[model samples]
Every structure is written in structure tokens, then in C-alpha cells.
Target: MPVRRGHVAPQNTFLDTIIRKFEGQSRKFIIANARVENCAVIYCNDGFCELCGYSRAEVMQRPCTCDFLHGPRTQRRAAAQIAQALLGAEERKVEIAFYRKDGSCFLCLVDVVPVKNEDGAVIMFILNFEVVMEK
Candidate 1:
């Protein structure tokens, strides 16, 4: 396809459908509206609730306490790195130790991406993560 000035590309319905399915199955996916104090969970998947030991009813519309959810020994540097990425509007991946409701600790992989508006301003963030090792 030749590039034309001001010519928008055709929307790929099939690809959109595929993306929807993929996100739907992404249990660890979360969409949060960034805030100065804490990010509010706008949307969370069943996998997130299960992994965090919180039900959707408990987590939805609530500020994220994921830092506290981590073990006391969890490295603060990891959390700080993620915060820096979000504040800088850059993507980052960090490994941290997270805790479940039962206080069981697990090694988790956190991936953060900034979702921006047309004006190139960040509106929110999409965080995808999963437990890679459990203790």
C-alpha cells in the first residue's frame, strides 16, 4: 500500500476481533487511572482477582495497594523503577515479590505500559503481571 497524505489506513476488523479475544483471556491484565496518591482500578480481570486474593467487588474502584501487597522484604527499588517508568511515560518490566491474602510470597513479573491520549498525554496505565515463582 502506498502512503498518501492524510489518508487513514483501513481498520482491520479481524485484527481487532483477535485483540479483543487476546485481552479477554489475559487474566493478569489491569487498567488503572493514574493518580498522584494512588492509581484507581478501572478494570481488572478474574485472573487478577484470583491472584491477588481479592474479589472483583473488593478491588474495583479501589486504589491500588499493590506495594503493600508485596512482602515487607520486597525490594523497594523494584517498585521505584516501575513508578519511574509510569511517571516518565515509558514501558518497564520489574520482578518483585508479591503476597497473597494468606501472606504467601511469590515472585512476580510486572509489566507496565502507559496509555496516552491523542495529545500525547498519559491518561492511564495498563499493567500485566503474573506469578512466576511461589513460596
Candidate 2:
């Protein structure tokens, strides 16, 4: 964490290129990058903003994936599953039922991949989300 005008700025180079590479798609998908420490959201796209009803500011301020869902109050179980997956390190996909900013909930499919460095150390995780509607 480097200091930037009294505030800490996440080193934002590596993921920036990756984020840019992923662009328009037909599905409602959200893309985000997380730090290795606790999966803190470092960057996310507008689709993520639409999914959470929170801008990059709000989501980044929260820190960690579960910080948005840790409360037993809402999306508790789904949040736990995600936390478990991040911790277990054996997960490829997790079904998530989470609420959007509009107070509506959707069952989403989460696809996770660890973005590794040349040394094979994971510096970040890239999460791709697709909203699935039920019949």
C-alpha cells in the first residue's frame, strides 16, 4: 500500500490491463479483481456496479468480498459459500443468491480464477459473474 496524499492507493497497474481486455458481452456479467490478502475488491466494472447498486467507491470502501455479505442479515449463506471457496482454494464455481442495490435478489453463477505472476504466485483473483434467471 503506497501513500497517496495521505490515503493509501492500491497499486493499480497489472489488473488495469486485464480489466480493459474484457469488454462487452451479451450476458449480464460483472468482473472484479481482488487482492490475495482477503480478496478485497481493487477494481470492478460497471456490471458489478449494476449488480450491487454500489459504485466502485462504495464497494472498494467495504473491503473483502464478505464485508458486503457477512451479516446474517442478508445473503448470509451465499456469502459464506463464497468465503469458503476463497479459503478452500479448490473452487471453480459457486452459486450465489445476492441482493442488488434495488433490493432485488438474483441467483448468479460465479466463476473464479486466480491470476498468477510469472513465478506462479497468485497476486490477484479475477471473479466473473453471470446472472441467471429462474423459470
Candidate 3:
């Protein structure tokens, strides 16, 4: 990962420490800065890159919403609920359509949780992404 200048590095480390706890177990997950306007991605594992077909370099600093993954078939209602949950700093689980880099859409189960500081203020969000398999 590139060392971002200024306050970015320290903040990244802080997030890293918190998210690293789950780093080993989860196959596809991302951490985003809840303090930012867009909740930009701070860290994503190789599993996530493989699932979304995005390189770590390409996903870094991008919105955790992964708007690029939204296509014509994606549901706005599901997106709205997720957005509302993020705004409320609440945990949510939703099944939504997300597009891969190749423009093929797939159903995804997204679990979002807000990470809080000692003061109980939300500082980051951890989003676990899983592909929904059809039987």
C-alpha cells in the first residue's frame, strides 16, 4: 500500500489495527472512513479485490459504497436502506445486485457495521461482501 501523506498515515494505522482483527477470517471485506463525506475505502483484502475484480490500488480511496458496482439492474430500494443505515451508524444486512468489473451483475449479501471510538463516535465502517449463490 502507498503511504499517504499527512494525517492519512496515522489514521490508516488506527483503522488497520481495528480491522486487522477480522482480516484473516473473512474472505471479502473492506474498511471505510466513516468520518469522510463518501466513506472512502481505507483497506481491502485480496479476497475483496478478486470478488469485485478491482485491484487494491484501484479500490483504495474509492467510496465504500462501490457505486461503480451499481448497474441498471441494481435495486435503488436496497441501496437506499443501506445508505440510511450508514447515516444512522447502524448495522444492516441486505441483498443487492452489484456489478463486477466485467459488467456482469451478481447478487451480493452486504453486511455493514459501524466501528466506534472510545467516545462512542463512529469512526469507521466494516462492510463484509459475499456473493449470493442460487440453488
lDDT of each: 0.70, 0.58, 0.70
- Predicted candidate 1 versus true structure: per-residue lDDT over 1-135, tens digit per residue: 886688667898887676435423664777777663445668877777766677678777554436656555788867687778667756787878776776666778777888988998888888888556656
Rank all candidate structures by their lDDT, best first, as comma-separated numbers.
3, 1, 2
* Candidate 3 lDDT over residue span 1-135, tens digit each: 998666632357676565545423566777877557655777887777766677667777566665677656678866777788788767887777876665556677778898888999777888887667421
- Reference-based TM-score of each model: 0.65, 0.58, 0.68
Steric collisions counted per model: 0, 0, 0
| lDDT winner between candidates 1 and 3 | 3
Clashing pairs in 2: none
Residue 39 of candidate 1: its Cα lDDT?
56
lDDT of 2: 0.58
> Ten residues in a row with the worst lDDT in model 2?
23-32
CA error at residue 8 for candidate 2, angstroms? 39
Residue 92 local lDDT, model 3: 87
Runs of candidate 2 with Cα error greater than 4 angstroms are: 1-39, 63-77
Which candidate has the highest TM-score of all?
A: 3
Clashing pairs in 3: none
lDDT of 2 by residue, 1-135 (tens): 965676666877997665434422423433345443444666666656644667667765544353564356545656666677677544466665666555656566666667778999776676776656421
